[PDB]
Structure formats: C-alpha cells, structure tokens
C-alpha cells in the first residue's frame, strides 16, 4: 500500500538480516579476519557482479527499468582494477573459481540475462547496488580501519560518478515506485529479491568455510 520501495525492504527483511548476520561478514567488518579475506569476498563478487552486469545489460537494451539501470553504477571493471592492486598483479584472473554457491547465483543471472527477466533483474540489482549504495561507505571504512587496505583498492565502494549519494538512493526508490508492474510481475519480483538475499548468504557462508 506503500510503493514498491517499502514492500521490497518488507517482503526481504527476514533474508537481509539473515545474510547480514552471516559469521563471515561479522567476522571481517569486526576486524578479525584480514586483507586476505577481503580480497576473496571482493573476487567471489566479481564473479557474480559480471553476470548481473550483463542481465542487466540485456534488461537495459530490452527497454526495461533504463533509468533505473544506470550504467554508472557498474562494478565489475572497478573490482578487477581494485583485485589487480589487492593481488599485485593480474594473476587472479586465471586462478579464482567460483565457489557453489556463486555457482547458483551466477546459473539464476544467466537465466534471466537471456530470459530477459526484467521484474527479476530489478530484484537482484536493487538487492546488490542499493546495498552497495547504501552500507558499502560502512563496509570501505571498517576495510580501511581494521587492516589498511588502501582507498586506491576500494573503487568498488566510490560509485566513481555520483556526487550525492543520498539524493541518488531517494531517486532510486522513486523509480522503483514508478515501475509499470502486473500483479503477477510484483509477486515475481519480490520473491526473487528474496531469493538474492539467499545466495549471498549462502556466498557469505562458503567464503567461511
Ligand atoms: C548480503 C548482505 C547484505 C546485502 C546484500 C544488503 C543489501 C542492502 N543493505 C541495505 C541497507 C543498509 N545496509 C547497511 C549495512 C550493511 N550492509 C552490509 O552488507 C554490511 C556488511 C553492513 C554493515 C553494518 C545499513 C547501515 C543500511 C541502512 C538501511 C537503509 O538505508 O534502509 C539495503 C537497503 C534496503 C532498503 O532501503 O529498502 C539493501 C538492499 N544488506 C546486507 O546486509
């Protein structure tokens, strides 16, 4: 009754707090892990961060959500450009595997890249960059604090191109208020928004193990 933006932040409370609270995630922003860490959280992401990238690359060409698709919100190029400083060189590229569960998440953005699911893109994309937009400064500073890692190796967090950053998330909610969507689309929608917050804790999770 209250817009999709309210809805959406509802409908995925229960699995935000779920993947909030995983012991990797705590473990790292409380400082008792270490760069290494970081650096394998900030490779698994770009692995999954390529494949919502073209989803929403295809999503965009479809005619879909194309003001709320802002391309300057692309991370993929920046995390490798902040992994090639994090590992020294661009050896990572060659080495990293995606651990299962960015097995699973990867297999769901592929599918909807080439379903060009639009409902189901919007879902992961505000799950990923709206939390990128909205905790990452939280995130770059306890990296910062806790083990030195250098602003330099913290692109993915800058959102390089926007200046205010809490007019570009209102903005952000607006246009996801003002998405033409069916019943049937919404519904689709909200329960992949949960679905993404269930792969990244399950990401959160293998990076523990
Ligand atoms: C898989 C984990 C995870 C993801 C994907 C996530 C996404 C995410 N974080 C958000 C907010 C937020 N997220 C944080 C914080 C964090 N967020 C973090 O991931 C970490 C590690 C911190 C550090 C405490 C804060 C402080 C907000 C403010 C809430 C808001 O503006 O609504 C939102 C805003 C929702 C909305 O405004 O309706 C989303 C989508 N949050 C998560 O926790």
Redesign the pocket.
Known sequence: TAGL?VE??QSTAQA?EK??HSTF?SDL?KGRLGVAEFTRLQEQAWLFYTALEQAVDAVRASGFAESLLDPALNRAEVLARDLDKLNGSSEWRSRITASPAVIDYVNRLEEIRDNVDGPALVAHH???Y??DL??GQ??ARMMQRHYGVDPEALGFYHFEGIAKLKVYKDEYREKLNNLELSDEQREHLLKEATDA?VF??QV?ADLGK
């Open positions: 933006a959406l932040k935000h993947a909030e995630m922003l505000y799950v990923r709206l939390g909205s905790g939280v995130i917050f990244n804790h959160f």
